[PDB]
């Protein structure tokens, strides 16, 4: 959310006057004249706990687990039960670690 | 007032010329969406404020 969604004058009416104690926009004339402004209830108000761009987006994995996972992923590409059970139709294919010559 | 300065009635002439409907050839134009003049001012309800 871009900034405050509070770029709006609003104070409560507070007292009696038989309406709920949410802040109301000021002035008159326009439709937006006594409507309930900011708060996570209101049309035109501000959302609950607006997202910040400094949420932790990126994660660390230490290097000997990244290498563990990539030794575990090549070794499963060499078992025909595992590589067919992912979807790849390798039924007509020859010897399962398919290597070809360096001319390709 | 009938006593007015020249800036006032070259202001009141500009507000008097744009108090005018749309022409009826203009809703026939391709792709538009204006259908009546919504900026029309009546001399009793809405007042200019000098």
């Amino acid at each position: 959310s871009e900034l405050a969604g509070h770029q709006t004058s609003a104070e409560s009416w507070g007292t009696g006057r038989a309406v709920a104690r949410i802040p109301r926009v000021r002035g008159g004339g326009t439709h937006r004249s006594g409507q309930g402004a900011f708060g996570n209830m209101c049309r035109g108000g501000r959302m609950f706990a607006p997202t910040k761009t400094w949420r932790r987006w990126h994660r660390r994995v230490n290097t000997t687990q990244k290498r563990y996972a990539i030794c575990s992923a090549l070794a499963a590409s060499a078992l025909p039960a595992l590589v067919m059970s992912k979807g790849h139709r390798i039924e007509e294919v020859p010897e399962l670690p398919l290597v070809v010559e360096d001319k390709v | 007032s009938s006593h007015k300065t020249f800036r006032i009635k070259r202001f009141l002439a500009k507000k008097q010329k744009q108090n005018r409907p749309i022409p009826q050839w203009i809703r026939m134009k391709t792709g538009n969406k204006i259908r009546y003049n919504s900026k029309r001012r009546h001399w009793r309800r809405t007042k200019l404020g000098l």
């Binding site: 009696g16 004339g29 006594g34 | 259908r35 009546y36 919504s38």
Partner: peptide
């Protein structure tokens, strides 16, 4: 013609105060 025009915002302002006053027993 046909297509008319918009009216005006209600712009209500509060007024009266618990009717005609009144103070409880002291």
């Amino acid at each position: 013609s046909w297509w008319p025009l918009p009216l005006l915002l209600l712009l209500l302002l509060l007024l009266g105060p618990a009717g005609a006053r009144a103070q409880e027993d002291e």
